[PDB]
Design a protein around this nucleic acid. Structure first.
Ligand code: MG
Lengths: 219, 200
DNA sequence: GATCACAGATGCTGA
DNA sequence: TCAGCATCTGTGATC
């Protein structure tokens, strides 16, 4: 339903991912690819889409590490839309028979925290899926769809949001609202019980908690 | 014991037999659309990889996607086989793009399985499956929050709070003040203040 | 036609 | 994706 094509295709790569064949492929499809340290995940696609890239075997490996679902729930807490892209065959040779595990995980990542899975065949596939997501999610809409003014994509904003999210009571939406209000973390970290409760979604109780955290001296 | 309703016309599929033999109660119903009804909320659509592709290029896939999405809260399309069948090497851009569009514009969820075994494993999983961290002492929330800054460990978070005794105090300290803390140099300090001070 | 208090709907966080 | 519950809101009783 969203109609209009958006701006210059742009995404941020986390540094740990920078190494991939993926970024060069991405640039080769005309996507601007900016390598930065992101709080989480490997590709920042739009303000509310994070992408975590995993080879089918790292998918497997981290399922049994315990790594997978910790990472999973973090991503799902902080971004409104999480894509895990699995690159290569869903079940690698080395992992046959353990398939009941793998597919079960997939079904759980999907139902438990609403994460979204794409399976790609190679880097180029991942690079295509990322590029399409980038394009699709930009796009401002047509019939009866308001267009809002949208914050420019940045890593610095992402961390500003990651830092706000770490507070009790402060989640995805509120962190955003806190930024539009105060314009700055430091202006926010400086306001009063009163002013922090002005925010849609925060009450006296959560405001008190926040203030008390900001101010209580450390023994 | 998970129940799943299988549509009559899916019943030629190899999948349901495997389902049966994993303890899933396979019941045939006459489905309004879809291949397996996993709950009232959750419908599954099973397509072979080159069926997915064939129907991408017919324009049936997106028509089907439409009805699935309108008539059910959650929609899965399980695509059995490699995402890009040989017949379609060279149109992959078109395939993945459709996968992107299915998820962002229709909200539809995809799985990719390697064969009927996987598809049945996935279905069974869903059938069953729908059947810090921090806790409030202020001192601890403090060490948590600081530790979500780039580069900052627990030991550095400690030392930060030793020097400045308060977050509010740290959050307003000078680049020079901050970068002197042990385990925060110029590099990490620059980022911190950039984070602290960059406007919307 | 305005306030208000409060009970229950909304919409969030946190996973 | 969704439980659990904080925050918000619509309602209707009163002035
Ligand atoms: Mg990764």
């Amino acid at each position: 339903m969203l109609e209009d094509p958006g701006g210059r295709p742009r995404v941020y790569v986390d540094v740990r991912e920078e190494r991939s064949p993926v970024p060069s492929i991405l640039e080769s499809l005309g996507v601007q690819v900016i390598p930065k340290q992101l709080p989480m995940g490997d590709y920042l696609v739009s303000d509310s889409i994070i992408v975590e890239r995993k080879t089918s075997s790292d998918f497997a490996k981290s399922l049994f590490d315990g790594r997978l679902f910790e990472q999973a729930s973090r991503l799902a807490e902080h971004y409104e839309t999480v894509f895990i892209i699995v690159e290569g065959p869903p079940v690698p040779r080395r992992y046959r028979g353990r398939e009941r595990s793998l597919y079960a995980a997939m079904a759980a990542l999907q139902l438990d925290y609403g994460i979204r899975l794409m399976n790609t065949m190679d880097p180029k596939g991942t690079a295509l899926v990322i590029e399409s997501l980038a394009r699709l999610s930009t796009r401002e809409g047509g019939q009866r769809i308001v267009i809002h003014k949208k914050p420019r994509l940045s890593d610095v904003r992402e961390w500003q949001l990651y830092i706000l999210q770490s507070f009790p009571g402060i989640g995805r939406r509120t962190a955003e609202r806190i930024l539009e209000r105060f314009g700055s973390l430091e202006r926010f970290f400086t306001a009063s019980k009163a002013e922090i409760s002005k925010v849609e979604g925060i009450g006296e109780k959560r405001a008190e908690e926040i203030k008390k955290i900001l101010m209580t001296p450390y023994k």
